[PDB]
Design a protein around this ligand. Structure first.
Ligand SMILES: Cc1cc2nc3c(=O)[nH]c(=O)nc-3n(C[C@H](O)[C@H](O)[C@H](O)COP(=O)(O)OP(=O)(O)OC[C@H]3O[C@@H](n4cnc5c(N)ncnc54)[C@H](O)[C@@H]3O)c2cc1C
Ligand SMILES: Cc1cc2nc3c(=O)[nH]c(=O)nc-3n(C[C@H](O)[C@H](O)[C@H](O)COP(=O)(O)OP(=O)(O)OC[C@H]3O[C@@H](n4cnc5c(N)ncnc54)[C@H](O)[C@@H]3O)c2cc1C
Ligand SMILES: Cc1cc2nc3c(=O)[nH]c(=O)nc-3n(C[C@H](O)[C@H](O)[C@H](O)COP(=O)(O)OP(=O)(O)OC[C@H]3O[C@@H](n4cnc5c(N)ncnc54)[C@H](O)[C@@H]3O)c2cc1C
Ligand SMILES: Cc1cc2nc3c(=O)[nH]c(=O)nc-3n(C[C@H](O)[C@H](O)[C@H](O)COP(=O)(O)OP(=O)(O)OC[C@H]3O[C@@H](n4cnc5c(N)ncnc54)[C@H](O)[C@@H]3O)c2cc1C
Lengths: 447, 447, 447, 447
């Protein structure tokens, strides 16, 4: 069987790996239009901050190692079109310009997403950067040590926007994060968390300008100013981390796409075309908290989807098990983690939830290593099934979100978690741990 | 209603708390034979090691604060007998010697356990100590700084035995842990883990003498030598942490007891006598990994049982949800956590299990903060349902065991966990985290 | 020649060492009335604080190692009298009670000093301790971890008093230092320094009660209260570190003594009796800052004097070179060092001095590791010769006081030090280092 | 009086400061040919290593702050010639090209030195850098984070060469230091020290190629290889830190110069021309260790000379007091300091010296914070006067070299230092400190 896998990032890569597991027999071709195989953009901050020194080590596969296992790797080769009917694909070697047709028995694509750019005045002024991929990573590292960069403006206060802000602030630049949303990191955390995070960032030379629409970039040749409807800010460098758009324009009319460009697929990763499967940022995923499907552009999700596509290559036998949307990140001294439904997700979904937040030391008061911890447990009003949770502390308590991810999937209730067995040892936690305590507060609130 | 609660430790205390939640109306009497209310023996190591300076802060309730909420606290008062038929109890004020009878409508007891003592020659030689309670804690702290103590022998290589060994080694004493069992901490961890832990402890002046039966203590007036069948060891202080025995002798014939002294109770915490409930170390608990019941002397378990007894005070409506036996502890630079069935538990239960162990860095290789992590996933041969897990690292990854505790309870399989949604961010974990990786190895092993 | 050396501490010990250097031929007898050879009381704080665990390692010679080099060590043997005329000494073996006479050709004694005790009401109440020697060190360590000790009162705010206060405060006790003097550590530092040190100690649970005379100790059997003329303080333990008295009572009439008990000696360490030499705390020493002689009870001084006595054993050929009184100590986060004349010494001596104090970061402002440093340079009004200096910082800059000690001895001026060659490297200091800057300020002040 | 000061670095700057002290009356003109006033090249490593983030903060004066005190600052203006006879100077505004003549009553010049460049094949290949000044500092920082730089070769194993090597190694590059000299840092330290330092650097990805003459640079357009007589090395960047040459070519025939270009001056900083004074790297300085004069290109020396020139502006009244050549630097975990004559200096001077080296823990053995320290004391064979010393440890003991600098100046002997008063406190040092111990070993060696 000849299987073509498009993309060398998380969705494409785990598909190649699963093909080696379940189909060592097959002729596998792996296509990547860029010059570098499997760069991990998730590690870009570790690199920019100087924890990881070599940009080229921030990966998880070389093309050269995949060829050693019998995979035909074509870097700098773009798949330009699909002819599903004919079971052919058009590919173009970007080094030589030479186009060719390639045949397949099964095709798995993981096209990913492209950074959304603000189509406003001054869009083509120099030093308005993006943050995705190796090329942007090295350019951004050039700018961290550039003595001509003093003020950095990052547009977008999400995950990437805050990583960019932290890296440039730590590097010694004055940063302003600008967004129309009124809370940084609202997709991940609720207000009692984002207010502490805002305060923490402000203590580190970051202004966070919420509720502002960017209107135009000003400057002679290069940016010099970012102008919003409420204010104007000096900028020597801009980092645009506002959103992502599915890389699917080329597929319009070949495959069925949702109005926003995401490829329509079922729980077996099959597209509208037989033998064409799609995964990753460009697709929707089964979201277990609300038994629905949403778009969650995370590496974890792309990875599992890539494997499940190979699992269903010849017949629909393994339905995808669903995800809870879990995240975790450190923002200066704080480490947070989140899974399931929080305010922003509940509003997008139109789901009424109930919740309790416990903010107290996570160790018993006699232990001087005690530190304050925030934990919010979100649950269903009717069934009291666990729908989400968020936690934060200067202590690293993030691995607890893994327990909540399973509780949601398992449809456990607040009474289940209130009395759930979690170990106790006073150097690590309180008699009723962080999850137990929140759940007991939730049953108290439902008396 | 007049409710009498015996014991001011974890089982007794959470019962008083739950009575305040669900029965603020009742006359509550709380009895404790010792002079101190709610001392936390779980924090004794933090104290001995000098992280917590005041022995009296290692608690979670004062008698004086409970009386402020209308509970009648009787410290230094021992319940000597129960007359269930009459719904009376015999109590004795140990300060005054004056016995009296007390009436009740419901009685909840949490008698706990007593350290098992080796009935061998030299048993009454001075400086053979135990490690449970406030009185022993202050005596053991006296010995950590005693210049006449050089060699310390701790008998019992379990949880308490190793805490005692670490505290005395850190304090500067030569320690030898002695046990007939061939592995330290075998109740919690399997051999690939306990070999690393043995090596770590040996690097810290601790000899671990496994496979040896202690025969006699030698010394003139005070210990001077501990003699086993394979060897003899100098000892200035001995700490006996070999086991626990249910504090139920006084109840024989009043309540039905299992052959080892544990009080027979059902899933609603009711004893063989109507209106008498029992919880904690002295009882068995529903153990969800193998849908059975076992004795697991842990604070977590006592706490939840104490609350469930009050929940079922007037009628059996809340069946206990079960526990997985979870633990966690740091042993010098390593932190481990464990839940469910491991080798020792499988042998006690006679259950055949299958398992995989993954030992590799928990962060991707390009990140210099990467450290080695051990994770073993135990599962059912037939169903591949998750039955247990153990993990260890110098990095603190223990909160992940909370996810596994729920996976076992939920009867999740290795395929469920292989593709379970766990967040990825390269400062915190690898694309497929520690649980995902072990579960993928387990499906690989079942191909 | 038979040389008898009295005392196994700093003066006695360096004399034995120098006898081995210059007289390997001689029969040497080394006497010590205590049970332990060469304990270092200078290391008692490191021990009490738990940095050094074994009390017996805080030494610099064993009796057993000295006998290996042919010295006859008599521990537990007290020299009770000297008959200089006859060249005999009376010694008593304290184990056996048996007195004997011993002959000598030369005798070198280093009797040291005894802690001064306040002869007031309640002087014989239990738990009023002292801080000198091994026996007191182990007793004080017993008290650091005693749960019955809550309030500790140390009387005397000098070097020892503050070590005692820091050790007990760090151990978790409430401390009050009491003294009639109005400044802690005034013998070492001037007010701009002791005010910062007072503030630092107060931030660590230490009250410093200056200007108060202790009148009586109160308590039933054991101390319970310390009463001064201005106030009364609860005390579970008292540490008396107010002064020292020469251990010379037994010598009155045998050797000429100054009115305060110090043995009269010349610059060659000879007493009023031929062939009897005396050194250490019990003598005066040449003090080069003011070309006078003062009593400075420091180990450094005893050590050098011990060697110089052997140097002048047969004839006065090596006049003692003099000392500057140098000290250094850390008090919580601060490290200070001092040499020469400061306010208190100038008042005792009646010497008019001039001085400048510079308080600024010790590194150039662009270097974020910069920290504030205090340096005071004291000089002669007329000649501008360097008479003393004091420095302090949370950075350890103490070794600079060694340069000043030599500058005073050499009779260097403020102009000499202003332009003295001290290296510059911006990770270590400013272009004009801490000494240069103070000296330039002193010439500025003499314009 | 109109005083012209040439150069805004250490010699020029301290002259302007001293003019403000002693001559606030005068018209002062301060000339600097570069665009930046008072950059501190001594702080370039702190900057390259990322401890100091802003290149522009690494200074000690702004032109703008000096004008505020009435000094006429002319940056970007080069003094092209001196007409001493006429008391005029030719200056050229490098921005406008306009030359002019300026008059003076007194002229003080601090021209400094220029990096020596190897006139070999390939000298004009791109990426062969130097390390002096702001412009080179920012270029070198560009290269630390450049992903195309892998191998860095620094030619010259002196102070600057090793700073450059450490900065690039810490930044993640493979470094090779190349020099004809057989020991790195030989001008500062002797072999027992430089062998430990070599080993330390090799443990950090630095090859140190001693005894090799560089013959040619190879590469197409940019360096690619450095070829020596014994070997060839790949190089993406070269840093040339081999020497300095006096910036005096323009003065030949105006002022008398030594054969190597240094300006001839007396102990009052006067040149061969009346009213023209010269200081800094371009001059010789009185070197007190051997009562001679040598060229020591250090900031300390330039600073003091700058002030002494103003002190002797109207008449020779303040003879320069001399320097000892003191240095100090950290090289990875080690901190060393040095003053006076060591092997290399003794060979240049032709002076026979004697020396002892003590290598042992600097704290008493019972204190676990003890660390190994190296100290070498160099002295005169005949008089035993202190001629130099070197010390090194992972503990920072460098401030002790300040004591030795004064001992040499004062002509103290090994017997003086053996019994010199240095404080003792066991958290800081041994009874006989690091200087005392070395000096006692030196008297032992002269028995
Ligand atoms: C800065 C940053 C930080 C992030 N951090 C995290 C994190 O910490 N945790 C987490 O879970 N997620 C994180 N993510 C999200 C995660 O990286 C993405 O969800 C994941 O990369 C998506 O994988 P994908 O395969 O669907 O697409 P992509 O990553 O977009 O990869 C698609 C690849 O296919 C190639 N390609 C596209 N079209 C063609 C074509 N026609 N022919 C040939 N090649 C083609 C592209 O060049 C690209 O290399 C982060 C993302 C960014 C940018
Ligand atoms: C050193 C040590 C470390 C531990 N660490 C941990 C840990 O880190 N995590 C964890 O989960 N568990 C830990 N445990 C176990 C945990 O402490 C026990 O499981 C828990 O205390 C049991 O609670 P209990 O109420 O059943 O009994 P107990 O703790 O035994 O308390 C019974 C109380 O009732 C009183 N009493 C008994 N009989 C009478 C009577 N007749 N009348 C009046 N009063 C009476 C007793 O004085 C006692 O105070 C540790 C135990 C020890 C000793
Ligand atoms: C807690 C403390 C901290 C200190 N810290 C420092 C410091 O950090 N730096 C510093 O420089 N100094 C310090 N000192 C001071 C220093 O320890 C003393 O200056 C030094 O010990 C004095 O030495 P000595 O030989 O004169 O007398 P002592 O130390 O008093 O020793 C005399 C010895 O001789 C014995 N002896 C006396 N009479 C007889 C006899 N008749 N026959 C036989 N044996 C006899 C005694 O038992 C004693 O052991 C400190 C002192 C104390 C108490
Ligand atoms: C990387 C490095 C690290 C160092 N580290 C240390 C250290 O840690 N400790 C230490 O003591 N020393 C150190 N030094 C040495 C110290 O910096 C020099 O000794 C000192 O700078 C010399 O001062 P100067 O005034 O004589 O000359 P320079 O520093 O050479 O300055 C001369 C200035 O005058 C200007 N100038 C020259 N000619 C003219 C003209 N004709 N007209 C107008 N302007 C002119 C030049 O542009 C220059 O700015 C280091 C040097 C370097 C390069």
């Amino acid at each position: 069987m000849k299987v073509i896998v498009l993309g060398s990032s998380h969705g494409g890569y785990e598909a190649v790996e699963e093909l080696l597991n379940l189909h060592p027999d097959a002729e596998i071709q792996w296509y990547e239009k860029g010059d570098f195989i499997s760069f991990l953009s998730c590690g870009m901050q570790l690199y920019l901050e100087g924890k990881v020194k070599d940009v080229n080590s921030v990966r998880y596969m070389t093309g050269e190692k995949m060829e050693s296992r019998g995979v035909n790797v074509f870097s700098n080769t773009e798949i330009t079109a699909i002819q599903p009917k004919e079971h052919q694909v058009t590919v173009k070697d970007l080094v030589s310009g030479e186009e060719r047709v390639e045949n397949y028995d099964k095709l798995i694509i993981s096209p990913g997403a492209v950074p959304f750019e603000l189509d406003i005045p001054g869009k083509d002024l120099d030093n308005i950067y993006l943050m995705r991929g190796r090329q942007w990573a090295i350019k951004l590292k050039q700018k961290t040590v550039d003595p001509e960069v003093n003020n950095v403006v990052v547009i977008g206060s999400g995950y990437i926007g805050i990583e960019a802000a932290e890296a440039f602030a730590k590097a010694g630049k004055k940063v302003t994060v600008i967004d129309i949303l009124d809370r940084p990191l609202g997709v991940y955390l609720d207000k009692e968390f984002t207010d502490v995070l805002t305060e923490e960032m402000e203590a580190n030379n970051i202004t966070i300008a919420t509720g502002e629409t960017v209107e135009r970039y000003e400057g002679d040749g290069r940016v010099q100013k970012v102008v919003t409807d409420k204010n104007a800010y000096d900028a020597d460098l801009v980092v645009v981390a506002v959103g992502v758009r599915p890389n699917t324009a080329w597929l319009k009319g070949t495959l069925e796409l949702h109005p926003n460009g995401l490829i329509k697929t079922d729980e077996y990763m099959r597209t509208s075309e037989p033998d064409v499967f799609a995964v990753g940022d460009a697709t929707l995923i089964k979201y277990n908290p609300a038994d629905t499907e949403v778009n969650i552009a995370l590496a974890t999700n792309a990875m599992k989807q890539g494997r499940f596509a190979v699992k269903n290559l010849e017949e629909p036998v393994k339905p995808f098990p669903g995800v809870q949307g879990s995240s975790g990140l450190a923002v200066f001294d704080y480490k947070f983690a989140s899974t399931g439904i929080n305010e922003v997700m509940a509003q997008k979904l139109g789901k009424e939830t109930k919740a309790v937040t416990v903010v107290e030391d996570y160790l018993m008061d006699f232990n001087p290593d005690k530190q304050k911890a925030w934990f919010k447990l979100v649950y269903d009003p009717e069934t009291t099934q666990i729908l989400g949770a968020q936690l934060m502390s200067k202590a690293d308590l993030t691995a607890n979100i893994n327990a909540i991810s399973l509780a949601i999937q398992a449809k456990m209730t607040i009474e289940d978690l209130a009395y759930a067995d979690f170990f106790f040892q006073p150097a690590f936690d309180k008699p009723w741990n962080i999850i137990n305590t929140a759940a007991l507060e939730a049953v108290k609130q439902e008396r």
